[PDB]
Amino acid sequence: GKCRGLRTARKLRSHRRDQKWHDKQYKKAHLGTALKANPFGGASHAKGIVLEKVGVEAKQPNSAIRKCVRVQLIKNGKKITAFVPNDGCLNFIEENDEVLVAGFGRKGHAVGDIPGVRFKVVKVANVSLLALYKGKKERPR
Amino acid sequence: GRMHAPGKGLSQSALPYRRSVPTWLKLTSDDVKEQIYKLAKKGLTPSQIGVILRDSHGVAQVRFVTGNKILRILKSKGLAPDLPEDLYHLIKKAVAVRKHLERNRKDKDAKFRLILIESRIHRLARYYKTKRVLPPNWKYESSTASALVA
Amino acid sequence: PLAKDLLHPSPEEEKRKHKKKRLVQSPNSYFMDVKCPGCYKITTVFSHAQTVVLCVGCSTVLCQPTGGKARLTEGCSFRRKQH
Amino acid sequence: VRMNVLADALKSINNAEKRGKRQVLIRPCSKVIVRFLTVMMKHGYIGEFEIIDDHRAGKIVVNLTGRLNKCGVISPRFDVQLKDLEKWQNNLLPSRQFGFIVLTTSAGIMDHEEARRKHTGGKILGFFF
RNA sequence: AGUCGCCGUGCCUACCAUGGUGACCACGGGUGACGGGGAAUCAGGGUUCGAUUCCGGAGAGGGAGCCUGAGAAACGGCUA
RNA sequence: CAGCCGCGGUAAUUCCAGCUCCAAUAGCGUAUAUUAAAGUUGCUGCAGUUAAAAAGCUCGUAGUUGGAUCUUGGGAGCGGGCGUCCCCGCCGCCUCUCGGCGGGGCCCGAAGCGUUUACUUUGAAAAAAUUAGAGUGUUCAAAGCAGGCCCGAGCCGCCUGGAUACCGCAGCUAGGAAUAAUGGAAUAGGACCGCGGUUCUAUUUUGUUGGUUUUCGGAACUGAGGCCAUGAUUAAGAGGGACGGCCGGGGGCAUUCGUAUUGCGCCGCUAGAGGUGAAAUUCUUGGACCGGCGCAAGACGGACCAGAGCGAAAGCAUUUGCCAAGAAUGUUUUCAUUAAUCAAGAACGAAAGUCGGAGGUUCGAAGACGAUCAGAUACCGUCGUAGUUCCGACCAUAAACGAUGCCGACCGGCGAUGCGGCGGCGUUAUUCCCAUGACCCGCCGGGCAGCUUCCGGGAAACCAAAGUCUUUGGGUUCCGGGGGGAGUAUGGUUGCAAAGCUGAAACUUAAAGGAAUUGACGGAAGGGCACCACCAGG
Ligand SMILES: [Mg+2]
Ligand SMILES: [Mg+2]
Ligand SMILES: [Mg+2]
Ligand SMILES: [Mg+2]
Ligand SMILES: [Mg+2]
Ligand SMILES: [Mg+2]
Ligand SMILES: [Mg+2]
Ligand SMILES: [Mg+2]
Ligand SMILES: [Mg+2]
Ligand SMILES: [Mg+2]
Ligand SMILES: [Mg+2]
Ligand SMILES: [Mg+2]
Ligand SMILES: [Mg+2]
Ligand SMILES: [Mg+2]
Ligand SMILES: [Mg+2]
Ligand SMILES: [Mg+2]
Ligand SMILES: [Mg+2]
Ligand SMILES: [Mg+2]
Ligand SMILES: [Mg+2]
Ligand SMILES: [Mg+2]
Ligand SMILES: [Mg+2]
Ligand SMILES: [Mg+2]
Ligand SMILES: [Mg+2]
Ligand SMILES: [Mg+2]
Ligand SMILES: [Mg+2]
Ligand SMILES: [Mg+2]
């Protein structure tokens, strides 16, 4: 059972300490391994350079092509894949366009029917792609 | 219970509620201490002394006829032995087993039982040494102490 | 079973219990007085004696012990009237 | 082993009364119980009790009239500081009307109301309702 | 026992003794570590943050040494 | 498109658009940390039979936790609805060895000020700003500390305010004394102008004087005495040891017995014998298998053998003898709290396996053959190595399972069984009547189990414990936190080697799983049925 004395505090306080590491979230945060291995240095957004444009296939019960891009970063130098959410919007992207990327919403985990994508593009050439879609603006030719 | 075993027995005695003396006994404490002294010359423990009086003379409890215990009585006279009874017998029993074991060196129950016994001893002496009967440096060496016993 | 009295148990009931488990403890033994026909002494003995008593003359024996109560020499009478 | 004399008795009061008995026997018969029982009886939750004597711990008998729900004990004996009564008594009791936390203190063994009317705290033992 | 020091002290020097800390966690290493009053959340208990207008400490490119002065090892003073 | 489940494969409630509607509103969406939800890190307050999970068993230091017991009433001054239940001082003790309210008072700082604390109540002393919060119609509010009056305006002025609380822990001060720990007189000590005496002896007296003892105080030391009710709590349904009669496939050493098997010798008669679903490999007139009498060697200890016993667990079975331990019972013996659980550390630990000697019947991993098979380097049959056996050292694992930590209490019945003790009609016993079992009939203890129930629990199966748990706290130990990667990589440690102990992370994924239910299925079992099935036949 449980210790439950009047002068047992060192034991309990100890027991909770070494036994808290067996929780996934605490362990992830308070160790640097996930942090130094995250392409973003504990950050939300990041700018980077385009170097390819590819199409990723989906999972089994669906069938499509999800129009992603290979992207290199400025600060770190690493490489990643990213997704372009909307109909007809890949054509808005040229080569070497200095985009801004972000997460998707699951904090490091893959989302949906895409095999291994956890970043989405937001701003190309500093003109707010969503606005560009809606026709509130055009690109800086 | 049974500090080194699994049993749960309750076999033991039950003193009565009337502490008095039953008025058929026509024997007096001065005579009792005499008979105790006689039985103490010939080398008998306190417990052996009490059973005899109860069996063959009609004495239940010395503490009621007298007012003192048997061990205090002797020590008033100067006849109590060097060691206590309890510690003495444990040391006796150990020496036999080890002797038995010197020859039949392939009996593991005896080894196991031996380690139990010695464990019982080091506890008991920590009582008598705190309680100031044994000196601060008395110890059981296991190579001597065949000679303390007999 | 839902109603009793425990202060005042039947004597036959408290008698048929273990020594301690009675409402109050109680011993189960007695002293007694022996005759020894070849003598005219009266020596007194405990029931569960766990010893061998020799006579006054060192002539005979009275009780040989046992796991429980003792025995007598099959010619020796005891008076269990003490107190 | 029986490291606590009060814990066991209240259990052996509670179980029996939870069954439907009229009398019970509880063995070790110590001083502190007697106070604890006296204050229960005084408020009316039980009948009388007769305490058997022997040249030992003693023994004791009670008469129930089982209008009691639960009898409880809190161990280790904590230390109250007279501002925390509310936080103890809301999360041990069923309501703000009835039920008594009993505590020893320099004046004696009393319930929590009397402690506040005398303005002193102490150490906690148990509770009943 | 003395030297130096505004004064007490192995702070330093000579002669002696062999001691001091530790499972009630020393020692070693890490800190996205200046500390506290405090801030957010909050039935009751707690979890996390606190560079940031108040108090105290440290530093003025990295290191070391000094003059003046009641007060500085100053840096909008000097010398390497 | 979609945080998740999911939508789209020519009639899309989910895509691209238009009408229409919904929510918040000068604000609304998106990403990432961080709180609540999370009783999914649990002190308050989880879980550990089968869902993830209790070390193989035992001992053991630090740690944590520890039985009962020593002044209670009855009163007194009182206030309510001789009295009676609830309210308020007292029956904290004196201390004068002393202080100062030649000797008399009544009280205090001191002297115990409290044996030493913890505990609780009070008081002090806490930087401000911030927080809770008092006052004030900032045009309300956020804020901020200001403001209001009579009046020709004379009042050359009047009233005012700038609160209060909290401020864990250590430290300080004074009261109360239940709870918890400690101390005191046992090879004796407290008190008595106490009494002698061996010393120093400071000023009191010797008016001032020269020195000594001198009555003086308090020192160390030594001698004799009366006084105290003269000093030790009881002995746990807590424990250790003693003692008595028994108990048992408990453990070690030596010893006797048994049928079987395999081989060998001699005798007898005769062609097959083995083994299989069926066969063959193989043995066989140079005499197999069968029967008969002998000899040898090495293993194993049948039936009796049980939901029976013993042991810490692993595990334990022929006879006898020896050696040293143990439980339970019985007890008007003894010591007197000596104890429960336990990091580090230490003993034991099936089978396989490793090391060195002796031995080697039977069985038989490897290995070789003959069969079945589409194929079989397997299931079958014949041979056959390591090993299986003993002596001496290594290793330290298992479904090492009651898949269920140890200690202690409480909680319902019934009939049995095994050990010990207590009794009672009767039968036998035996050899003339007794103590031995055997039964017959009951009781008591502590054991291995069992049947029954609305005790009560639980997801249920089920369980007198897996109960006494939202009415949550008896004491304590080890361990778990979605599924895989993974008991993996690496570092350290032991070991002759094999391996053991400690023990990750990236990445991946939305389900893996438990108990029970209805179908279907079954080269699973029990009843029946049909020429779109069979037998016999056209
Ligand atoms: Mg133990
Ligand atoms: Mg820093
Ligand atoms: Mg700061
Ligand atoms: Mg500076
Ligand atoms: Mg710079
Ligand atoms: Mg400088
Ligand atoms: Mg400056
Ligand atoms: Mg500058
Ligand atoms: Mg959280
Ligand atoms: Mg909550
Ligand atoms: Mg959970
Ligand atoms: Mg989680
Ligand atoms: Mg709760
Ligand atoms: Mg499992
Ligand atoms: Mg106690
Ligand atoms: Mg260990
Ligand atoms: Mg083996
Ligand atoms: Mg072997
Ligand atoms: Mg070999
Ligand atoms: Mg063979
Ligand atoms: Mg294991
Ligand atoms: Mg297991
Ligand atoms: Mg369960
Ligand atoms: Mg609980
Ligand atoms: Mg996991
Ligand atoms: Mg499973």
UniProtKB/Swiss-Prot annotation, chain A:
GO biological process, one term: translation
Principal localisation: cytoplasm
Residue span of region Disordered: 1-25
Biased composition (Basic residues): 1-19
CDD domains: Ribosomal_S23
Residues modified as 3-hydroxyproline: P61
UniProt keyword Membrane, yes or no: no
Record bears the keyword Ribosomal protein: yes
Cellular component terms (Gene Ontology): cytosolic ribosome; nucleolus; rough endoplasmic reticulum; small ribosomal subunit
Modified residues (N6-succinyllysine): K53
GO function terms (MF aspect): structural constituent of ribosome
Keyword terms, alphabetized: Acetylation, Cytoplasm, Endoplasmic reticulum, Hydroxylation, Isopeptide bond, Nucleus, Ribonucleoprotein, Ribosomal protein, Ubl conjugation
Source species, domain of life: Eukaryota
Pfam families on file: Ribosom_S12_S23 (PF00164)
Modification(s) after translation: Hydroxylation at Pro-61 affects translation termination efficiency.
Subunit structure: Component of the 40S small ribosomal subunit. Part of the small subunit (SSU) processome, composed of more than 70 proteins and the RNA chaperone small nucleolar RNA (snoRNA) U3.
Role description: Component of the ribosome, a large ribonucleoprotein complex responsible for the synthesis of proteins in the cell. The small ribosomal subunit (SSU) binds messenger RNAs (mRNAs) and translates the encoded message by selecting cognate aminoacyl-transfer RNA (tRNA) molecules. The large subunit (LSU) contains the ribosomal catalytic site termed the peptidyl transferase center (PTC), which catalyzes the formation of peptide bonds, thereby polymerizing the amino acids delivered by tRNAs into a polypeptide chain.
UniProt record similarity statement: Belongs to the universal ribosomal protein uS12 family.
Protein name: Small ribosomal subunit protein uS12
Organism (species): Oryctolagus cuniculus
Source species taxonomy: Eukaryota, Metazoa, Chordata, Craniata, Vertebrata
Name of the coding gene: RPS23
From Swiss-Prot, chain B:
Predominant localisation class: cytoplasm
A GO CC term attached to the entry: cytosolic ribosome
UniProt PTM comment: Ubiquitinated at Lys-26 by RNF14 and RNF25 in response to ribosome collisions (ribosome stalling).
Cysteine-cysteine disulfides: none
Molecular functions per Gene Ontology: small ribosomal subunit rRNA binding; structural constituent of ribosome
Cited Pfam families: Ribosomal_S13_N, Ribosomal_S15
Covalent link location (Glycyl lysine isopeptide (Lys-Gly) (interchain with G-Cter in SUMO2)): K42
Residues with Phosphotyrosine modification: Y37
PTM-bearing positions, type N6-succinyllysine: K26, K33
Phosphoserine modifications at: S29
Cellular localisation: Cytoplasm; Nucleus, Nucleolus
InterPro entries the UniProt entry points to: Ribosomal_uS15, Ribosomal_uS15_arc_euk, Ribosomal_uS15_N, uS15_NS1_RNA-bd_sf
PANTHER family on file: RIBOSOMAL PROTEIN S15P/S13E (PTHR11885), SMALL RIBOSOMAL SUBUNIT PROTEIN US15 (PTHR11885:SF6)
HAMAP family: Ribosomal_uS15_A
Function: Component of the small ribosomal subunit. The ribosome is a large ribonucleoprotein complex responsible for the synthesis of proteins in the cell. Part of the small subunit (SSU) processome, first precursor of the small eukaryotic ribosomal subunit. During the assembly of the SSU processome in the nucleolus, many ribosome biogenesis factors, an RNA chaperone and ribosomal proteins associate with the nascent pre-rRNA and work in concert to generate RNA folding, modifications, rearrangements and cleavage as well as targeted degradation of pre-ribosomal RNA by the RNA exosome.
Protein name, per record: Small ribosomal subunit protein uS15
Species the sequence originates in: Oryctolagus cuniculus
Lineage: Eukaryota, Metazoa, Chordata, Craniata, Vertebrata
UniProtKB/Swiss-Prot annotation, chain C:
Gene3D superfamilies tied to this protein: Zn-binding ribosomal proteins
Subcellular location(s) per record: Cytoplasm; Nucleus, Nucleolus
Cofactor: Zn(2+)
Record keywords, A-Z: Cytoplasm, Metal-binding, Nucleus, Phosphoprotein, Ribonucleoprotein, Ribosomal protein, Zinc, Zinc-finger
Record-listed Phosphoserine modification sites: S10
Mapped zinc finger ranges (C4-type): 36-58
UniProt biased composition (Basic and acidic residues): 1-15
Cofactor note: Binds 1 zinc ion per subunit.
GO biological process terms held by the UniProt record: ribosomal small subunit biogenesis; rRNA processing; translation
Disordered: annotated segments: 1-22
One GO CC term on file: cytosolic small ribosomal subunit
InterPro entries cross-referenced by the UniProt entry: Ribosomal_eS27, Ribosomal_eS27_Zn-bd_dom_sf, Ribosomal_zn-bd
Binding positions (Zn(2+)): C36, C39, C55, C58
Gene Ontology MF terms: structural constituent of ribosome; zinc ion binding
Pfam families in UniProt: Ribosomal_S27e
PROSITE patterns per UniProt: RIBOSOMAL_S27E (PS01168)
Domain of life: Eukaryota
PANTHER family: 40S RIBOSOMAL PROTEIN S27
Subunit structure: Component of the small ribosomal subunit. Part of the small subunit (SSU) processome, composed of more than 70 proteins and the RNA chaperone small nucleolar RNA (snoRNA) U3.
Family: Belongs to the eukaryotic ribosomal protein eS27 family.
Entries under HAMAP family matching the protein: Ribosomal_eS27
Described function: Component of the small ribosomal subunit. The ribosome is a large ribonucleoprotein complex responsible for the synthesis of proteins in the cell. Required for proper rRNA processing and maturation of 18S rRNAs. Part of the small subunit (SSU) processome, first precursor of the small eukaryotic ribosomal subunit.
Record-given protein name: Small ribosomal subunit protein eS27
Gene name per UniProt: RPS27
